[PDB]
Amino acid sequence: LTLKPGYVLQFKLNIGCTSQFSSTAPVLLQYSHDAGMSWFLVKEGCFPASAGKGCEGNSRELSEPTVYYTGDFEEWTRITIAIPRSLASSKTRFRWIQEVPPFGLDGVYISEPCPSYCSGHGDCISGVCFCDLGYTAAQGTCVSNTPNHSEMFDRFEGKLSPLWYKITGGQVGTGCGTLNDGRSLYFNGLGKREARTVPLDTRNIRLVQFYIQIGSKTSGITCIKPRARNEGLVVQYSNDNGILWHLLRELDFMSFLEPQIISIDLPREAKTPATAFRWWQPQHGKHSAQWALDDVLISRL
Ligand SMILES: [Ca+2]
Ligand SMILES: [Cl-]
Ligand SMILES: [Mg+2]
């Protein structure tokens, strides 16, 4: 199929309703310009250490590879990719290869840009939006039937805040020791490690605050010392429920061997009726220092 730059690739994925990870066979989303014999990943990943083409200088958008590890896909998960200039070349073929539970695909939609990409709350079919449950079509896009939550606070002492949209590769735990107090949100997963909020109404939010630790000098095998720059963390916001992420703060791989507090004053652009936040470690969990958050606070101050 022929593609133009700002087009969009969409699908759903459920590998085998597993919480358990396997390194045996992840689903690789790959493309083909020469239609068959050569395969590259749709996204290689744009990482802190990366310096090639499509990921250089101050224009880069730090981004995960299109590689999907068994165990990170318990339920059905919609993936929406904005087709970059970088690969808007010739008629592209797409591959979903596993190399082991069989992966369930669904709703493979390739389309021209919808109004505001359906705000991340609908399927973009041939250029206009098909909103999911809880959302209705409005001004070309998909808007929530109800307003969004604003403030958030999680101390990680028991049940996770319902304002977490998805926690991948992590759970309430103690593997890096004490951060502020009690238990923390602890990341030891072997695939992707990401804490991601639901979209919030940040129009009057001033502060995003949290404690962080990445690795340890002394805590042992549950919190090993980081070795490479891609084991640092990226804190990002999105105004379209995760289609496009913008940098809030990059946390250096060697600067958080002991717990530290981080307080981020939100920029204007991150103050909307529907802005989600995420904490993500770019390098694959299998070879990466574990990390933890404590007392995540999103506040009007
Ligand atoms: Ca705590
Ligand atoms: Cl910092
Ligand atoms: Mg750095």
Side-chain angles (χ1 to χ4, degrees):
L1 279 151
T2 167
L3 267 279
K4 285 173 181 182
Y7 271 42
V8 58
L9 189 176
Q10 296 152 112
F11 65 94
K12 337 258 184 170
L13 224 179
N14 195 325
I15 298 172
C17 326
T18 336
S19 271
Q20 283 196 337
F21 172 89
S22 185
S23 194
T24 60
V27 183
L28 301 97
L29 170 53
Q30 297 173 322
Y31 72 95
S32 191
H33 275 332
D34 47 64
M37 56 162 52
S38 179
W39 300 98
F40 290 159
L41 291 162
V42 163
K43 302 277 183 177
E44 182 195 322
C46 176
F47 286 3
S50 304
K53 269 187 177 191
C55 183
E56 52 184 282
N58 67 356
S59 80
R60 66 203 305 160
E61 299 312 310
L62 299 160
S63 187
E64 325 143 61
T66 47
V67 188
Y68 309 116
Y69 303 98
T70 153
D72 291 342
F73 289 91
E74 265 275 39
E75 342 284 67
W76 287 99
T77 311
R78 176 204 277 150
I79 291 150
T80 300
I81 301 149
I83 300 304
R85 329 86 69 113
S86 222
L87 54 92
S89 300
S90 191
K91 76 260 196 187
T92 309
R93 273 177 175 169
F94 294 108
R95 198 193 200 190
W96 287 260
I97 178 150
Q98 201 159 240
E99 301 272 329
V100 185
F103 60 96
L105 290 181
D106 201 4
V108 177
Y109 314 123
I110 299 89
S111 165
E112 335 83 61
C114 277
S116 188
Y117 285 114
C118 306
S119 288
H121 291 298
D123 276 292
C124 181
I125 321 252
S126 207
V128 257
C129 295
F130 286 109
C131 306
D132 37 46
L133 287 81
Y135 302 84
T136 46
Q139 288 186 24
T141 189
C142 297
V143 180
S144 190
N145 280 174
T146 51
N148 295 318
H149 300 289
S150 148
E151 294 188 298
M152 179 177 184
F153 186 49
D154 202 338
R155 296 177 42 80
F156 305 121
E157 297 313 333
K159 200 159 199 177
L160 289 157
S161 177
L163 305 206
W164 296 110
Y165 180 62
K166 184 167 74 286
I167 305 301
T168 303
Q171 58 290 135
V172 172
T174 54
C176 283
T178 302
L179 273 58
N180 185 32
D181 52 55
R183 306 205 278 162
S184 62
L185 191 54
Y186 167 66
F187 292 82
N188 64 171
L190 303 174
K192 178 160 84 154
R193 296 174 184 161
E194 178 193 74
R196 168 180 168 181
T197 75
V198 296
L200 302 168
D201 180 359
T202 52
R203 286 172 297 183
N204 301 120
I205 292 299
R206 252 70 60 166
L207 169 84
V208 174
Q209 190 177 259
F210 55 94
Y211 288 75
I212 176 83
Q213 189 178 318
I214 305 166
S216 201
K217 291 163 290 200
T218 72
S219 306
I221 66 170
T222 60
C223 203
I224 69 155
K225 189 157 156 153
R227 291 165 282 184
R229 289 206 177 260
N230 289 334
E231 296 177 66
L233 266 281
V234 182
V235 190
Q236 280 170 328
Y237 71 94
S238 177
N239 294 340
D240 50 21
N241 193 39
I243 295 165
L244 254 66
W245 291 102
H246 310 270
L247 188 68
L248 269 178
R249 175 79 58 95
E250 203 184 296
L251 302 168
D252 172 76
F253 82 123
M254 290 302 297
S255 300
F256 302 95
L257 295 173
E258 297 181 18
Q260 304 289 345
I261 200 172
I262 296 296
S263 308
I264 304 171
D265 202 0
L266 276 189
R268 321 154 53 245
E269 299 94 342
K271 303 189 180 178
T272 85
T275 292
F277 298 96
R278 79 163 175 182
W279 289 256
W280 163 64
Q281 185 179 43
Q283 189 171 286
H284 181 216
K286 189 56 128 270
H287 300 96
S288 299
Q290 306 91 331
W291 53 277
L293 303 169
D294 209 356
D295 291 358
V296 170
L297 172 66
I298 300 163
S299 165
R300 71 206 136 83
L301 199 105

